[PDB]
Tab-separated table of C-alpha atoms (C1' of nucleotides) and ligand atoms in Angstrom:
chain	number	residue	atom	x	y	z
A	1	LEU	CA	20.091	-21.825	106.229
A	2	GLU	CA	17.182	-24.207	106.902
A	3	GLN	CA	18.174	-27.505	105.314
A	4	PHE	CA	15.448	-29.822	106.616
A	5	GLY	CA	12.991	-28.181	104.228
A	6	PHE	CA	10.083	-25.808	104.562
A	7	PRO	CA	6.769	-27.310	105.718
A	8	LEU	CA	4.845	-28.664	102.740
A	9	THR	CA	1.545	-26.804	102.370
A	10	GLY	CA	0.424	-29.146	99.586
A	11	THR	CA	-1.194	-26.442	97.428
A	12	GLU	CA	0.570	-27.497	94.226
A	13	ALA	CA	-1.588	-27.085	91.125
A	14	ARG	CA	-2.415	-30.541	89.735
A	15	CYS	CA	-3.553	-30.791	86.112
A	16	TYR	CA	-5.701	-33.587	84.703
A	17	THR	CA	-7.202	-34.493	81.329
A	18	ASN	CA	-9.556	-31.500	81.332
A	19	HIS	CA	-9.413	-29.802	84.753
A	20	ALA	CA	-6.864	-28.521	87.251
A	21	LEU	CA	-7.226	-28.169	91.002
A	22	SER	CA	-5.420	-27.092	94.164
A	23	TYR	CA	-6.055	-29.326	97.172
A	24	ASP	CA	-6.756	-28.202	100.741
A	25	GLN	CA	-5.034	-30.957	102.723
A	26	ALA	CA	-6.393	-29.614	106.023
A	27	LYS	CA	-10.067	-29.689	104.938
A	28	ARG	CA	-9.882	-32.684	102.529
A	29	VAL	CA	-11.565	-30.522	99.860
A	30	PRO	CA	-10.286	-28.599	96.828
A	31	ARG	CA	-9.365	-24.951	97.186
A	32	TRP	CA	-10.329	-24.204	93.570
A	33	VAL	CA	-11.115	-26.189	90.425
A	34	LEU	CA	-10.491	-24.750	86.960
A	35	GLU	CA	-11.809	-26.203	83.706
A	36	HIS	CA	-12.268	-25.188	80.071
A	37	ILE	CA	-15.466	-26.082	78.205
A	38	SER	CA	-16.219	-25.588	74.517
A	39	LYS	CA	-18.739	-26.753	71.933
A	40	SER	CA	-16.627	-29.887	71.387
A	41	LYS	CA	-16.180	-30.824	75.064
A	42	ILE	CA	-19.862	-31.258	75.975
A	43	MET	CA	-20.447	-33.589	72.995
A	44	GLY	CA	-19.650	-37.270	73.383
A	45	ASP	CA	-20.903	-40.744	74.210
A	46	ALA	CA	-19.016	-41.143	77.508
A	47	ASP	CA	-21.544	-42.173	80.172
A	48	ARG	CA	-21.181	-41.584	83.907
A	49	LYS	CA	-22.882	-44.877	84.824
A	50	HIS	CA	-19.520	-46.633	84.338
A	51	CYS	CA	-17.619	-44.237	86.627
A	52	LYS	CA	-17.797	-44.179	90.424
A	53	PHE	CA	-16.113	-42.157	93.146
A	54	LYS	CA	-12.644	-43.210	94.297
A	55	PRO	CA	-9.795	-41.417	96.106
A	56	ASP	CA	-7.159	-39.690	94.023
A	57	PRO	CA	-4.083	-41.934	93.594
A	58	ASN	CA	-1.835	-38.855	93.471
A	59	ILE	CA	-3.146	-37.437	96.767
A	60	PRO	CA	-1.241	-38.936	99.739
A	61	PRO	CA	-3.615	-41.189	101.714
A	62	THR	CA	-2.922	-39.210	104.892
A	63	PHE	CA	-4.837	-36.197	103.552
A	64	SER	CA	-7.169	-37.931	101.082
A	65	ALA	CA	-10.862	-38.290	101.814
A	66	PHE	CA	-12.765	-41.536	101.343
A	67	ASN	CA	-16.283	-42.765	100.677
A	68	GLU	CA	-16.669	-43.725	104.355
A	69	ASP	CA	-16.720	-39.991	105.151
A	70	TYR	CA	-19.642	-39.356	102.775
A	71	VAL	CA	-22.027	-42.328	102.623
A	72	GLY	CA	-24.057	-41.910	105.782
A	73	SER	CA	-22.968	-38.343	106.520
A	74	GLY	CA	-26.265	-36.923	105.273
A	75	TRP	CA	-24.352	-34.938	102.641
A	76	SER	CA	-23.896	-35.599	98.944
A	77	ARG	CA	-20.680	-36.001	96.966
A	78	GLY	CA	-20.700	-32.776	94.967
A	79	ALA	CA	-18.235	-32.463	92.114
A	80	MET	CA	-16.809	-29.062	91.231
A	81	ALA	CA	-15.694	-30.076	87.744
A	82	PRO	CA	-18.912	-31.767	86.579
A	83	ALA	CA	-19.007	-35.003	84.634
A	84	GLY	CA	-21.364	-33.407	82.093
A	85	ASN	CA	-18.606	-31.067	80.875
A	86	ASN	CA	-16.404	-34.072	79.965
A	87	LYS	CA	-18.688	-36.090	77.680
A	88	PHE	CA	-15.998	-36.195	74.976
A	89	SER	CA	-13.379	-38.148	76.966
A	90	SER	CA	-13.972	-41.082	79.295
A	91	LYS	CA	-10.621	-40.388	80.968
A	92	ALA	CA	-11.492	-36.758	81.725
A	93	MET	CA	-14.870	-37.726	83.181
A	94	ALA	CA	-13.321	-40.522	85.255
A	95	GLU	CA	-10.841	-38.077	86.799
A	96	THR	CA	-13.726	-35.802	87.837
A	97	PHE	CA	-14.903	-38.575	90.195
A	98	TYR	CA	-11.686	-38.404	92.237
A	99	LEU	CA	-12.494	-37.132	95.713
A	100	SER	CA	-9.967	-34.320	95.129
A	101	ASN	CA	-12.778	-32.660	93.131
A	102	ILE	CA	-15.600	-33.334	95.624
A	103	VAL	CA	-17.009	-31.181	98.427
A	104	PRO	CA	-19.842	-32.049	100.866
A	105	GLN	CA	-22.890	-30.499	99.195
A	106	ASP	CA	-26.597	-30.453	99.994
A	107	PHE	CA	-28.536	-33.047	97.993
A	108	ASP	CA	-31.235	-30.699	96.689
A	109	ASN	CA	-28.669	-27.942	96.082
A	110	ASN	CA	-26.413	-30.306	94.126
A	111	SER	CA	-29.249	-31.592	91.943
A	112	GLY	CA	-31.081	-28.263	91.797
A	113	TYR	CA	-29.702	-24.734	91.832
A	114	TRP	CA	-26.076	-25.821	91.397
A	115	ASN	CA	-27.119	-28.182	88.606
A	116	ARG	CA	-28.874	-25.297	86.861
A	117	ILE	CA	-25.767	-23.109	87.091
A	118	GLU	CA	-23.680	-25.888	85.542
A	119	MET	CA	-26.163	-26.110	82.668
A	120	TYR	CA	-25.974	-22.343	82.159
A	121	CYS	CA	-22.181	-22.648	81.893
A	122	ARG	CA	-22.682	-25.268	79.186
A	123	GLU	CA	-25.270	-22.969	77.594
A	124	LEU	CA	-22.653	-20.202	77.388
A	125	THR	CA	-20.655	-22.421	75.012
A	126	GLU	CA	-23.472	-21.889	72.493
A	127	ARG	CA	-22.787	-18.129	72.588
A	128	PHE	CA	-19.032	-18.033	73.323
A	129	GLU	CA	-16.215	-20.078	71.833
A	130	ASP	CA	-14.258	-20.660	75.060
A	131	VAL	CA	-15.568	-20.624	78.646
A	132	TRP	CA	-13.363	-20.912	81.745
A	133	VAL	CA	-15.016	-21.831	85.049
A	134	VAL	CA	-13.460	-21.725	88.527
A	135	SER	CA	-15.440	-23.536	91.222
A	136	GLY	CA	-14.689	-24.103	94.889
A	137	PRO	CA	-16.030	-24.138	98.447
A	138	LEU	CA	-16.295	-21.353	101.010
A	139	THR	CA	-16.812	-21.033	104.775
A	140	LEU	CA	-18.068	-17.453	105.399
A	141	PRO	CA	-18.614	-15.880	108.836
A	142	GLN	CA	-21.894	-14.776	110.392
A	143	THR	CA	-22.655	-11.720	112.502
A	144	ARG	CA	-24.373	-12.629	115.761
A	145	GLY	CA	-26.804	-10.582	117.837
A	146	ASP	CA	-23.909	-9.163	119.883
A	147	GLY	CA	-21.900	-7.866	116.914
A	148	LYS	CA	-19.320	-10.671	117.026
A	149	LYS	CA	-18.583	-12.341	113.687
A	150	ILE	CA	-18.060	-16.104	113.959
A	151	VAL	CA	-17.090	-18.731	111.366
A	152	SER	CA	-18.604	-22.157	112.029
A	153	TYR	CA	-18.859	-25.198	109.762
A	154	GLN	CA	-19.137	-28.978	110.017
A	155	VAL	CA	-16.637	-31.807	109.573
A	156	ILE	CA	-17.784	-35.302	108.644
A	157	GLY	CA	-16.234	-38.756	108.803
A	158	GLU	CA	-13.145	-40.149	110.474
A	159	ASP	CA	-11.113	-37.862	108.213
A	160	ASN	CA	-12.566	-34.488	109.163
A	161	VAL	CA	-13.888	-33.363	105.779
A	162	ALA	CA	-15.041	-29.761	105.982
A	163	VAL	CA	-18.619	-29.051	104.879
A	164	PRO	CA	-18.722	-25.629	103.163
A	165	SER	CA	-21.421	-23.112	103.978
A	166	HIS	CA	-21.295	-21.418	100.559
A	167	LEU	CA	-20.043	-22.265	97.090
A	168	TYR	CA	-18.472	-19.884	94.575
A	169	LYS	CA	-18.233	-19.984	90.793
A	170	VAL	CA	-16.252	-17.650	88.522
A	171	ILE	CA	-17.154	-17.534	84.824
A	172	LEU	CA	-14.821	-16.073	82.191
A	173	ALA	CA	-16.044	-16.280	78.592
A	174	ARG	CA	-14.360	-15.302	75.318
A	175	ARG	CA	-16.461	-14.684	72.220
A	176	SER	CA	-13.924	-15.757	69.603
A	177	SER	CA	-10.180	-16.154	69.206
A	178	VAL	CA	-10.442	-14.180	65.957
A	179	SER	CA	-12.098	-11.177	67.586
A	180	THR	CA	-11.199	-8.022	69.485
A	181	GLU	CA	-14.452	-8.271	71.447
A	182	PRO	CA	-14.025	-7.693	75.199
A	183	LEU	CA	-14.358	-10.557	77.651
A	184	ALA	CA	-17.253	-11.338	79.986
A	185	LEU	CA	-16.717	-12.062	83.679
A	186	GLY	CA	-18.919	-13.030	86.592
A	187	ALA	CA	-18.412	-14.154	90.196
A	188	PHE	CA	-21.283	-15.879	92.011
A	189	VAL	CA	-21.537	-17.144	95.603
A	190	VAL	CA	-24.493	-19.372	96.552
A	191	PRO	CA	-25.220	-20.912	99.981
A	192	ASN	CA	-24.840	-24.676	100.368
A	193	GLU	CA	-28.564	-25.285	100.818
A	194	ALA	CA	-31.656	-26.054	98.770
A	195	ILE	CA	-32.679	-23.102	96.580
A	196	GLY	CA	-35.828	-22.907	94.473
A	197	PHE	CA	-36.675	-21.167	91.227
A	198	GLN	CA	-37.558	-17.794	92.780
A	199	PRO	CA	-34.067	-16.209	93.129
A	200	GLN	CA	-32.298	-15.376	89.885
A	201	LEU	CA	-28.609	-16.109	89.418
A	202	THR	CA	-27.935	-12.365	89.466
A	203	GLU	CA	-29.089	-12.272	93.107
A	204	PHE	CA	-25.998	-14.302	94.071
A	205	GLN	CA	-23.505	-12.245	92.046
A	206	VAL	CA	-20.675	-10.457	93.857
A	207	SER	CA	-17.806	-8.321	92.633
A	208	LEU	CA	-14.525	-10.066	91.910
A	209	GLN	CA	-12.675	-7.923	94.470
A	210	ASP	CA	-15.079	-9.089	97.197
A	211	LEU	CA	-14.845	-12.792	96.342
A	212	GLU	CA	-11.040	-12.635	96.271
A	213	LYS	CA	-11.034	-10.906	99.657
A	214	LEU	CA	-13.412	-13.577	100.987
A	215	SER	CA	-11.796	-16.696	99.519
A	216	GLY	CA	-8.213	-15.429	99.732
A	217	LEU	CA	-7.589	-16.384	96.088
A	218	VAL	CA	-6.603	-14.392	93.009
A	219	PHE	CA	-8.535	-15.576	89.957
A	220	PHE	CA	-7.015	-15.353	86.465
A	221	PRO	CA	-3.856	-13.427	87.459
A	222	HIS	CA	-2.636	-13.202	83.839
A	223	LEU	CA	-5.596	-10.907	83.042
A	224	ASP	CA	-5.445	-7.105	83.177
A	225	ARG	CA	-8.240	-5.382	85.115
A	226	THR	CA	-8.877	-2.894	82.323
A	227	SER	CA	-12.174	-1.254	81.422
A	228	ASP	CA	-12.473	-3.836	78.624
A	229	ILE	CA	-13.731	-6.555	80.991
A	230	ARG	CA	-17.532	-6.499	80.986
A	231	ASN	CA	-20.049	-7.952	83.410
A	232	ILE	CA	-21.377	-11.284	82.179
A	233	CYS	CA	-24.915	-10.567	83.399
A	234	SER	CA	-25.080	-7.483	81.153
A	235	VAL	CA	-23.471	-8.979	78.048
A	236	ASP	CA	-25.527	-12.148	78.593
A	237	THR	CA	-28.797	-13.021	80.318
A	238	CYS	CA	-27.497	-14.867	83.410
A	239	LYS	CA	-30.909	-16.569	83.638
A	240	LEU	CA	-31.083	-20.227	84.635
A	241	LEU	CA	-33.656	-22.682	83.329
A	242	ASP	CA	-37.067	-21.954	84.824
A	243	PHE	CA	-39.378	-24.638	86.178
A	244	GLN	CA	-40.713	-25.464	82.697
A	245	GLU	CA	-37.429	-25.854	80.802
A	246	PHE	CA	-35.693	-27.627	83.694
A	247	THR	CA	-38.466	-30.165	84.286
A	248	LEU	CA	-38.691	-30.767	80.531
A	249	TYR	CA	-34.932	-31.361	80.313
A	250	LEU	CA	-34.940	-33.825	83.213
A	251	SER	CA	-37.966	-35.639	81.774
A	252	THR	CA	-36.185	-35.885	78.413
A	253	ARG	CA	-33.087	-37.498	79.946
A	254	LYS	CA	-35.032	-39.760	82.341
A	255	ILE	CA	-36.725	-41.247	79.250
A	256	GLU	CA	-34.549	-44.386	79.514
A	257	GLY	CA	-36.661	-46.014	82.226
A	258	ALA	CA	-37.480	-49.063	80.067
A	259	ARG	CA	-40.618	-50.109	81.976
A	260	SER	CA	-44.072	-48.903	83.031
A	261	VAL	CA	-42.153	-46.055	84.702
A	262	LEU	CA	-42.089	-44.567	81.192
A	263	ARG	CA	-45.811	-43.864	81.517
A	264	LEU	CA	-45.175	-42.674	85.082
A	265	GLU	CA	-42.877	-40.027	83.584
A	266	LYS	CA	-45.668	-38.382	81.590
A	267	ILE	CA	-47.904	-38.729	84.672
A	268	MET	CA	-45.538	-36.633	86.784
A	269	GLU	CA	-45.095	-34.328	83.785
A	270	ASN	CA	-48.854	-33.962	83.244
A	271	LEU	CA	-49.690	-32.841	86.783
A	272	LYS	CA	-46.563	-30.636	86.605
A	273	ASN	CA	-48.426	-27.421	85.794
A	274	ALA	CA	-49.348	-28.123	82.163
A	275	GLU	CA	-46.306	-28.733	79.950
A	276	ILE	CA	-45.997	-30.318	76.506
A	277	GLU	CA	-43.029	-31.737	74.574
A	278	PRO	CA	-42.305	-30.876	70.908
A	279	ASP	CA	-39.924	-33.683	69.912
A	280	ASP	CA	-40.476	-37.424	69.522
A	281	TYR	CA	-41.717	-38.480	72.960
A	282	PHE	CA	-41.842	-41.999	74.457
A	283	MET	CA	-41.745	-43.965	71.195
A	284	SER	CA	-42.732	-47.002	73.238
A	285	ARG	CA	-41.554	-50.252	71.620
A	286	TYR	CA	-42.416	-52.815	74.293
A	287	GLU	CA	-43.333	-56.452	73.633
B	1	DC	C1'	-28.534	-33.572	84.696
B	2	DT	C1'	-27.551	-34.080	89.861
B	3	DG	C1'	-27.190	-37.780	93.363
B	4	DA	C1'	-27.515	-42.812	96.205
B	5	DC	C1'	-27.736	-48.092	96.534
B	6	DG	C1'	-27.455	-53.360	96.352
B	7	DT	C1'	-24.883	-58.854	94.904
B	8	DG	C1'	-23.155	-62.227	91.373
B	9	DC	C1'	-17.902	-63.548	90.329
C	1	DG	C1'	-11.343	-59.230	95.732
C	2	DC	C1'	-15.430	-56.525	93.924
C	3	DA	C1'	-19.172	-53.891	90.015
C	4	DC	C1'	-24.689	-52.474	86.742
C	5	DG	C1'	-30.332	-52.370	87.027
C	6	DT	C1'	-33.336	-49.848	90.177
C	7	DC	C1'	-34.950	-45.071	92.399
C	8	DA	C1'	-35.346	-39.715	93.464
C	9	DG	C1'	-35.153	-34.154	92.397
D	1	MG	MG1	-22.681	-32.319	91.439
D	2	MG	MG1	-22.675	-54.094	81.814
DNA sequence: CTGACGTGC
DNA sequence: GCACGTCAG
């Protein structure tokens, strides 16, 4: 037949401590990243200050990306499987810093709208027992003034790492293992750019048949497309943290300044459109 | 929470 | 050969 072997596409599913991915060796980015989060996963003392980005040892160095392709590129290192969903295990969080989970993402988008969607996925664990999330990059076309549709994206670094125009996220949530309740599903596609608090998450929702036709993937193939599957934005709220709750959450976590910056935190919070904190706030214990 | 950035061992 | 206090949104 053909004994020298078929060409290796390199799209083998690679499982880790808490996430699995399929690599795009031509774009140096993942095709899709799948993870499972529960009430137990997001709880833990594993800190991300000990972990830093490094290439995946299992990815062959010919197709692996590196930090040289990201540092001065004007783009951020955006993880698809977030470190916040792996607080229980230091090994699982450390594997999320492999560049086989990273895509070039806008700074404000990574820290803003995409960070709010990741928090909403963690918030769904407070209403569902098991939540599956599929995240990945996209490079969608654009219709020009002459009717011609053209795909165009950017590559950065010596290893041409593709910079996606849009990002997609697929959320599948199960209420309880001991329950006949139907499942909730939602597919969202957001552009890789800074987004404020005006557009709701429902404004970026698309049908699953349209995302599969766009990304060329088939999500959750072991699932039957019966009438049982319900939209996640009807069973749940699909609302992200507004300006108040988000700024209050960030100010609660940034409380470890350990200096006069502690008072500068309430300063920025005070002029931040009148907001107050209910818990124990800056219990300053400074010599 | 999501990022980037510099220096003693 | 590198690896932990600073800062921003
Ligand atoms: Mg990120
Ligand atoms: Mg230390």
